[PDB]
Amino acid sequence: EFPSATAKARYVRVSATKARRVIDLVRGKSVEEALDILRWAPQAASEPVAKVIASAAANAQNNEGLDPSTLVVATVYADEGPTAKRIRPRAQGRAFRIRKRTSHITVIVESRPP
């Protein structure tokens, strides 16, 4: 085991499968490397996930009191959240359904040795 800090972001207005597509870029990396990768990656879902990673780092800053530079994003994933249902009217009186999906991004970072 290694000392760990957690951060959760729930009900983020981003599809889970669109959050995972940038989560898969940064899994198992140092926090600073992950933050850089997210900051230059051209998909909008980076904005939530990046924040979540940073939030976790701060917890290890301020609640475990451990070294900034040893942090690695050990576990990160995106669960589905509640879906809102809407209607788009279509041709000849049809009415199709629209899903406004959300996500829960969870990150656990560990202070591994160098």
Partner 1 sequence: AVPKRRMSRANTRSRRAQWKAEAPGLVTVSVAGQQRKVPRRLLKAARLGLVDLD
Partner RNA sequence: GGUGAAAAGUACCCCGGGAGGGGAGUGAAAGAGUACCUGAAACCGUGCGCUUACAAUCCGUCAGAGCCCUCGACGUGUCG
Partner RNA sequence: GAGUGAGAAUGCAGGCAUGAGUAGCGAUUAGGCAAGUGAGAACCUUGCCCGCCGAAAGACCAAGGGUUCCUGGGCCAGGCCAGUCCGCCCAGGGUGAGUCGGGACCUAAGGCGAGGCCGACAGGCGUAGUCGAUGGACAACGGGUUGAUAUUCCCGUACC
Partner RNA sequence: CAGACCACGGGAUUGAUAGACCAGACCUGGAAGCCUAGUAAUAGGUGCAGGGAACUGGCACUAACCGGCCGAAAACUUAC
Which of partner 1, RNA, Mg ion, none lies near 54, with the C-beta cut-off 5 to 8 A by kind? RNA
Helix 31-40 / helix 46-62 crossing angle, nearest 10 deg = 160
Instruction: Report, in Å, the least distance between residue 113 CB and RNA.
Output: 19
Q: Is 22 left (phi over 0), alpha (psi -120 to 50) or beta?
A: alpha
The residue among 17 and 63 lying less far from partner 1, judged by its C-beta, is 17
3-state secondary structure 3-57: CEEEEEEEEECCCHHHHHHHHHHHCCCEHHHHHHHHHHCCCCCHHHHHHHHHHHH
**Partner from RNA, Mg ion, partner 1, none binding residue 15, C-beta < 5-8 Å depending on class:** RNA
x/- binding map, residues 45-84, to partner 1, per CB under 8 A?
A: ----------------------------------------
Q: Which of 39, 99, 100, 112 binds partner 1 (CB under 8 A)?
A: 39
Q: Which does 36 bind (CB under 5 to 8 A by kind): RNA, partner 1, Mg ion, none?
A: partner 1
